[PDB]
Write a protein that holds these residues in place. Structure first.
Motif, PDB file in Angstrom:
ATOM      1  N   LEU A   1     -15.075  -1.345 -13.803  1.00 33.06           N
ATOM      2  CA  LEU A   1     -15.607  -0.066 -13.349  1.00 33.06           C
ATOM      3  C   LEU A   1     -15.962   0.855 -14.523  1.00 33.06           C
ATOM      4  N   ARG A   2     -15.106   0.888 -15.543  1.00 31.13           N
ATOM      5  CA  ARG A   2     -15.368   1.747 -16.697  1.00 31.13           C
ATOM      6  C   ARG A   2     -16.683   1.340 -17.366  1.00 31.13           C
ATOM      7  N   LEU A   3     -16.870   0.042 -17.564  1.00 34.82           N
ATOM      8  CA  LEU A   3     -18.089  -0.451 -18.197  1.00 34.82           C
ATOM      9  C   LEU A   3     -19.307  -0.196 -17.319  1.00 34.82           C
ATOM     10  N   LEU A   4     -19.195  -0.526 -16.036  1.00 35.82           N
ATOM     11  CA  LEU A   4     -20.303  -0.336 -15.097  1.00 35.82           C
ATOM     12  C   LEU A   4     -20.702   1.136 -15.005  1.00 35.82           C
ATOM     13  N   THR A   5     -19.708   2.018 -15.024  1.00 34.20           N
ATOM     14  CA  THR A   5     -19.954   3.452 -14.969  1.00 34.20           C
ATOM     15  C   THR A   5     -20.712   3.884 -16.220  1.00 34.20           C
ATOM     16  N   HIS A   6     -20.310   3.359 -17.374  1.00 32.56           N
ATOM     17  CA  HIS A   6     -20.989   3.698 -18.618  1.00 32.56           C
ATOM     18  C   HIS A   6     -22.436   3.210 -18.551  1.00 32.56           C
ATOM     19  N   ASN A   7     -22.636   2.050 -17.926  1.00 33.61           N
ATOM     20  CA  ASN A   7     -23.968   1.471 -17.792  1.00 33.61           C
ATOM     21  C   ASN A   7     -24.780   2.108 -16.658  1.00 33.61           C
ATOM     22  N   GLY A   8     -24.239   3.163 -16.051  1.00 33.60           N
ATOM     23  CA  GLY A   8     -24.953   3.869 -14.995  1.00 33.60           C
ATOM     24  C   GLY A   8     -24.991   3.292 -13.590  1.00 33.60           C
ATOM     25  N   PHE A   9     -24.066   2.399 -13.258  1.00 29.79           N
ATOM     26  CA  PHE A   9     -24.058   1.826 -11.920  1.00 29.79           C
ATOM     27  C   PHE A   9     -23.096   2.552 -10.991  1.00 29.79           C
ATOM     28  N   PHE A  10     -22.364   3.505 -11.555  1.00 28.93           N
ATOM     29  CA  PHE A  10     -21.433   4.318 -10.792  1.00 28.93           C
ATOM     30  C   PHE A  10     -21.300   5.648 -11.508  1.00 28.93           C
ATOM     31  N   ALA A  11     -20.933   6.679 -10.763  1.00 27.45           N
ATOM     32  CA  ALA A  11     -20.757   7.997 -11.341  1.00 27.45           C
ATOM     33  C   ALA A  11     -19.328   8.442 -11.079  1.00 27.45           C
ATOM     34  N   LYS A  12     -18.675   8.934 -12.128  1.00 22.15           N
ATOM     35  CA  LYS A  12     -17.299   9.406 -12.042  1.00 22.15           C
ATOM     36  C   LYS A  12     -17.265  10.841 -11.541  1.00 22.15           C
ATOM     37  N   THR A  13     -16.252  11.156 -10.742  1.00 19.28           N
ATOM     38  CA  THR A  13     -16.093  12.495 -10.197  1.00 19.28           C
ATOM     39  C   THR A  13     -14.595  12.803 -10.111  1.00 19.28           C
ATOM     40  N   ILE A  14     -14.245  14.019  -9.708  1.00 20.86           N
ATOM     41  CA  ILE A  14     -12.841  14.404  -9.624  1.00 20.86           C
ATOM     42  C   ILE A  14     -12.403  14.851  -8.236  1.00 20.86           C
ATOM     43  N   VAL A  15     -11.319  14.260  -7.746  1.00 24.86           N
ATOM     44  CA  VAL A  15     -10.782  14.606  -6.434  1.00 24.86           C
ATOM     45  C   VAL A  15      -9.325  15.040  -6.540  1.00 24.86           C
ATOM     46  N   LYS A  16      -8.858  15.753  -5.519  1.00 24.34           N
ATOM     47  CA  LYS A  16      -7.493  16.269  -5.485  1.00 24.34           C
ATOM     48  C   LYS A  16      -6.434  15.196  -5.225  1.00 24.34           C
ATOM     49  N   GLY A  17      -6.184  14.908  -3.950  1.00 28.74           N
ATOM     50  CA  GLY A  17      -5.191  13.909  -3.585  1.00 28.74           C
ATOM     51  C   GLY A  17      -4.221  14.408  -2.527  1.00 28.74           C
ATOM     52  N   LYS A  18      -3.972  13.588  -1.506  1.00 32.33           N
ATOM     53  CA  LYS A  18      -3.062  13.955  -0.418  1.00 32.33           C
ATOM     54  C   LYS A  18      -1.593  13.853  -0.832  1.00 32.33           C
ATOM     55  N   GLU A  19      -0.717  14.398   0.006  1.00 31.25           N
ATOM     56  CA  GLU A  19       0.720  14.388  -0.240  1.00 31.25           C
ATOM     57  C   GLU A  19       1.102  15.189  -1.475  1.00 31.25           C
TER      58      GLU A  19
ATOM     59  N   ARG B   1     -24.663   5.590 -27.295  1.00 30.75           N
ATOM     60  CA  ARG B   1     -24.310   4.916 -26.051  1.00 30.75           C
ATOM     61  C   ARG B   1     -24.264   3.406 -26.254  1.00 30.75           C
ATOM     62  N   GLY B   2     -25.214   2.894 -27.038  1.00 28.95           N
ATOM     63  CA  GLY B   2     -25.294   1.467 -27.308  1.00 28.95           C
ATOM     64  C   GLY B   2     -24.067   0.897 -28.001  1.00 28.95           C
ATOM     65  N   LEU B   3     -23.487   1.673 -28.910  1.00 27.84           N
ATOM     66  CA  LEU B   3     -22.300   1.237 -29.634  1.00 27.84           C
ATOM     67  C   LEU B   3     -21.117   1.149 -28.683  1.00 27.84           C
ATOM     68  N   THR B   4     -20.931   2.193 -27.887  1.00 28.27           N
ATOM     69  CA  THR B   4     -19.838   2.236 -26.930  1.00 28.27           C
ATOM     70  C   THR B   4     -19.946   1.069 -25.956  1.00 28.27           C
ATOM     71  N   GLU B   5     -21.165   0.783 -25.510  1.00 25.10           N
ATOM     72  CA  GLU B   5     -21.402  -0.318 -24.589  1.00 25.10           C
ATOM     73  C   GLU B   5     -20.952  -1.638 -25.201  1.00 25.10           C
ATOM     74  N   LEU B   6     -21.330  -1.849 -26.458  1.00 23.43           N
ATOM     75  CA  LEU B   6     -20.964  -3.061 -27.185  1.00 23.43           C
ATOM     76  C   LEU B   6     -19.442  -3.155 -27.278  1.00 23.43           C
ATOM     77  N   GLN B   7     -18.801  -2.040 -27.613  1.00 23.27           N
ATOM     78  CA  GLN B   7     -17.343  -1.998 -27.722  1.00 23.27           C
ATOM     79  C   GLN B   7     -16.713  -2.314 -26.370  1.00 23.27           C
ATOM     80  N   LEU B   8     -17.265  -1.735 -25.309  1.00 21.12           N
ATOM     81  CA  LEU B   8     -16.744  -1.994 -23.974  1.00 21.12           C
ATOM     82  C   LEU B   8     -16.998  -3.456 -23.618  1.00 21.12           C
ATOM     83  N   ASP B   9     -18.158  -3.981 -24.014  1.00 21.56           N
ATOM     84  CA  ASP B   9     -18.509  -5.381 -23.744  1.00 21.56           C
ATOM     85  C   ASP B   9     -17.447  -6.272 -24.355  1.00 21.56           C
TER      86      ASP B   9
END
Ligand SMILES: Nc1ncnc2c1ncn2[C@@H]1O[C@H](CSCC[C@H](N)C(=O)O)[C@@H](O)[C@H]1O
Ligand SMILES: Nc1ncnc2c1ncn2[C@@H]1O[C@H](CSCC[C@H](N)C(=O)O)[C@@H](O)[C@H]1O
Ligand SMILES: O=C1c2ccc(O)cc2O[C@H](O)[C@H]1c1ccc(O)cc1
Ligand SMILES: O=C1c2ccc(O)cc2O[C@H](O)[C@H]1c1ccc(O)cc1
Lengths: 358, 358
Positions: free
Chosen positions: A69-87, B303-311
């Motif tokens: 997920l971290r790599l995919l997010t960096h590659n633009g396939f997902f976007a990170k956001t911030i949420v609260k949390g229950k309990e 961004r390219g460097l970070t991607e490589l590192q993540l890769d």
């Protein structure tokens, strides 16, 4: 001198290419994991835990999901956001949302490309590369796939023990042709002012059917070999005609050459283009020829696009010994045919729709 | 609405990632073809024919060489130029020259990385990806390699039927450690004002030997486990000491932690860092700790460097279930240890040399 120095950005350039394959594997993992579908179905940003819960992962795989997920997010396939949390436990957590690129992974949607990513990155598509060295140094003219397995790609898919692989391949192809509908919807301008159209090599009419779904009033003629059209009768705006495109093509306001010239050398392609110009002469300077194929523009400012096109060109070569033409090759072909000008419109990520004018 | 429209640049983004692996395969082909070596040996731009001649290719493979060359040239591994041509035949031909990136492919040079590219892209490194889906959905905690083959990567390399693979692997590792010399030559500033240095986990002294090749006057102490150093005696500036880095480290102006913290969790890494700060306290604010490992900077403009590192981080995970730290993780570690500041210097394409100060 100090040139010997600087282990340059040469090393970083070299390494970025060595490990580029990882980005392809991570993406492949995203589709097989069904992440997009899970987020889409949740209808709101999903948390790592929620997502791990939806995929029913073993607790030990959660951290693996996180890394991908971290790599995919960096590659633009997902976007990170911030949420609260229950309990009362917890505190602050990050959630994941889809982006335009990952939305193409949502199954059951006319835009889903999951099947193509699955096949393009299937072992049957990639394993042959281990035979590359032997392939360059042999005396036999064959594809890299044939060199690695001893059989053509097609024969492989048609083995009983490869039943599922073949269906995987046909799912991707069907999905690809389906995307042509998106091309039509996205470029109405191209067919808008036409009264008639001839679909060369239209087979049994599958492409003209999509064309009609968007332009029900356009008079379409499906032109192909006598044995292919055969019986097939049409309607008011559907017409089937048999013949030889190398001898002649039915007249119409426009000639569609969808993935036709691709399978022919310059000599044969030029003849088709010339017969195409003659099929629209009656319409004068109003007629047009529509070519749907790939065009590699090396002088393009979008280096990334050209690279992708060249990449795809290398797959065609290794898997089938096929080839794609460059913009120049197209221009030489188009003018040798007698046409005055042309316009190229990028479609489906890296394909091209070419409008040719007399 | 019109959002549904635009098959966006989402499709092109998706496809560029699908086919990224091709760039890695093309590069792999360049090294196995020995193109760099052939051009280097020619000592002048080489023509397609000349190059085909040097590789002794079958006439049918020439056009394949051309296709790979076009892509590699676009990717910056070769530069196109124009030459005349001997005899009355021909006319004008294109020649190919190496670039900084491809010069790293010239064998027999202290800078050659050919062995690393060969191993990182060997079937034993890539074939396991076909087991990725099964890997995410299983209950067993293991590497992706173990999931695909049933045995750890190490056990695989140590099988009699994998004799050549193991030697291939050790060639790459030896080549990698060798590159550390380039790191020293390229960052003299780091060790210049030092009188003494302790190489923690220095084993039998291979790293301190390279250090001496560049700084023959630096007093080095090779610190490791009692069983590793054992007998080993040194010279005026070479010293062997046995002990436990978790209890203490020999005092010196600087402490070198080359690829040490990498194999330890935060708890164990913090203790080492604390013992490191104590080993340089006597030198006051002049002492320093030198960490050689990978640091992934997500907020980096490159961004390219970070991607490589993540890769690379994803390879460590799939092959060994290993991990690399991010800049933040490093900062938390460094300050928790009691240090005041630190500086990171990029090395070897995507690695990092970290200077830590009390
Ligand atoms: N001489 C000829 N004249 C017309 N069609 C021909 C031909 N020789 C081969 N073909 C046709 O070439 C077609 C290639 S299929 C091309 C793809 C098609 N336009 C699509 O959109 O999917 C086949 O249907 C085949 O029957
Ligand atoms: N408690 C301890 N104290 C010192 N060295 C230790 C140790 N436990 C393990 N090691 C050492 O950890 C080392 C890891 S090898 C680290 C790589 C090395 N600095 C290089 O440049 O190649 C081994 O040589 C091992 O003997
Ligand atoms: O979409 C493709 C593809 C899909 C599934 C598969 O299993 C292999 C593949 O090979 C390539 O990656 C690509 C392709 C495109 C056009 C074509 O005629 C054949 C293959
Ligand atoms: O250099 C590497 C490498 C080299 C040869 C090989 O056959 C496999 C490999 O796996 C990775 O691609 C990479 C690596 C780096 C550090 C390490 O400890 C192990 C592997």
């Amino acid at each position: 001198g100090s040139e010997e120095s600087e282990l340059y950005h040469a090393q970083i350039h070299l390494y970025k290419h060595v490990y580029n394959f990882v980005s392809s594997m991570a993406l492949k993992s995203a589709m097989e994991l069904g992440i997009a579908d899970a987020i889409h179905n949740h209808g709101k940003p999903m948390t790592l835990s929620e997502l791990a819960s939806s995929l029913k992962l073993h607790p030990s795989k959660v951290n693996i999901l996180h890394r991908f997920l971290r790599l995919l997010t960096h590659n633009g396939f997902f976007a990170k956001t911030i949420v609260k949390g229950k309990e009362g436990d917890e505190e602050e957590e990050i959630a994941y949302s889809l982006t335009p690129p990952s939305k193409l992974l949502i199954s059951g949607k006319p835009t889903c490309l999951s099947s193509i990513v699955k096949g393009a990155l299937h072992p049957s598509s990639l394993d042959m590369w281990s035979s590359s060295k032997k392939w360059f140094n042999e005396d036999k003219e064959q594809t890299l796939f044939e060199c690695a397995t001893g059989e053509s790609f097609w024969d492989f898919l048609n083995k009983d023990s490869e039943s599922s692989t073949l269906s995987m391949f046909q799912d991707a192809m069907a999905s690809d042709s389906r995307m042509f509908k998106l091309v039509l919807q996205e470029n109405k301008r191209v067919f808008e002012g036409l009264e008639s159209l001839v679909d060369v090599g239209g087979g049994t009419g599958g492409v003209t059917k999509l064309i009609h779904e968007i332009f029900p009033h356009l008079k379409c003629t499906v032109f192909d070999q006598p044995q292919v059209v055969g019986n097939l009768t049409g309607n008011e705006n559907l017409n089937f005609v048999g013949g030889d495109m190398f001898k002649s093509i039915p007249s119409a306001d426009a000639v569609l050459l969808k993935w036709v010239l691709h399978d022919w050398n310059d000599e044969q392609s030029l003849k088709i283009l010339k017969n195409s110009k003659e099929a629209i002469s009656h319409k004068g300077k109003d007629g047009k020829v529509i070519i749907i194929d790939i065009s590699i523009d090396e002088t393009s400012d979008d280096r990334g696009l050209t690279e992708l096109q060249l990449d795809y060109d290398l797959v065609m070569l290794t898997m089938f010994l096929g080839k794609e033409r460059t913009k120049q090759e197209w221009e030489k072909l188009i003018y040798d045919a007698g046409f005055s000008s042309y316009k190229i419109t990028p479609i489906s990520g890296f394909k091209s729709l070419i409008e040719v004018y007399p």
